[PDB]
Copies of this chain bind each other. A is one copy, B any other.
Amino acid sequence: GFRKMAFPSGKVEGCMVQVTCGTTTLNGLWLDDVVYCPRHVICTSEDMLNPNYEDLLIRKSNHNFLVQAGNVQLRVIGHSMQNCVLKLKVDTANPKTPKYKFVRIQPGQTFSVLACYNGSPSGVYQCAMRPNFTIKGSFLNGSCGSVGFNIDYDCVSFCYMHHMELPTGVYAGTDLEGNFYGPFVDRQTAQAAGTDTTITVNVLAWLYAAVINGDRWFLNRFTTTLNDFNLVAMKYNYEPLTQDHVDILGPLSAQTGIAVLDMCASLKELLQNGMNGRTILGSALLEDEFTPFDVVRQCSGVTF
């Protein structure tokens, strides 16, 4: 058995609140005595085409932000804009605040999203920050301010806050300092995400997951070199593989006794030949949203 698993969401559930400004409602994250939320909460539908956020925020006072935790109204005593997020100082520290960090995650790393509407949890799933700084998710109107996170032991590392959907049907957002991942801006205009490259190291990790779990039909008799493999990767829009990537796979390699470059040769033939109707760990395509760490975590039953 190998599945895309999210972290347990309980620690984050207790941080979610509703933030309303005028007619716009979205989600906020309540840690200590601060509530973080997307700055476009201050916009009307008109404003969103071309908002001057500095001018818009100036017509706002503390009492114009309604912050609701369950059915309880929090008192806003302070507000400021940091990049693309609002920080609303409230008079009560969240008693459920977990140990936490803000972290700007690297492309190809994974996290869990707790999708929320009106300050209330809807569901949880695992995502990756793709090379082109988008994420594949499920967000609707009202989902903004939903957060992405990792849990190491007791510490929640928040890495993502949701802001927008792109014409591709993928999504974009910020770290918890309000800085977008990628080239995106919080305005309702047409915005290009670049080519969606595949996270090579993660595809390899997942092929190691398959072998560990008994799926081995794709193992072939060849090896390759980094330079030869990467020529193939470039054609298929794969990220180039580096010795750092090889090193990172070293644990899975040793465990399976399959050299990383042998697995590269297997991947190469999968890319060049397709899967011939066959599946790997129940998938008909090559999955790139498991990191090496994810694979070791899952295969060793790490708990938080």
Distance in angstroms from A158 CB to nearest chain B CB is: 16
CA distance A7 to B124 in the complex (A): 6
Distance in angstroms from A196 CB to nearest chain B CB is: 11
Q: Are B123 and A2 in contact (CB under 8 A)?
A: no
Q: Count chain B CB atoms within 10 A of each CB in A116, A117, A121 and give the residue with the most.
A: A121
Copy number of this protein in the oligomer? Answer: 2
**Interfacial chain B residues near A284, Cβ < 8 Å:** 283-285
Q: Does A78 contact B (CB under 8 A)?
A: no
Residue interface bits A45-56, CB-to-B below 8 A is 1, else 0: 000000000000
**Interfacial chain B residues near A198, Cβ < 8 Å:** none
Size category, A interface:
35 or more
Closest to A303 in B: B120
Q: Count chain B CB atoms within 10 A of each CB in A6, A123, A277, A303 and give the residue with the most.
A: A123
Distance in angstroms from A257 CB to nearest chain B CB is: 21
What 9 pairs across the A-B complex have the smallest Cβ distances? A10-B10, A284-B284, A5-B123, A8-B121, A120-B303, A3-B138, A10-B13, A1-B138, A284-B285
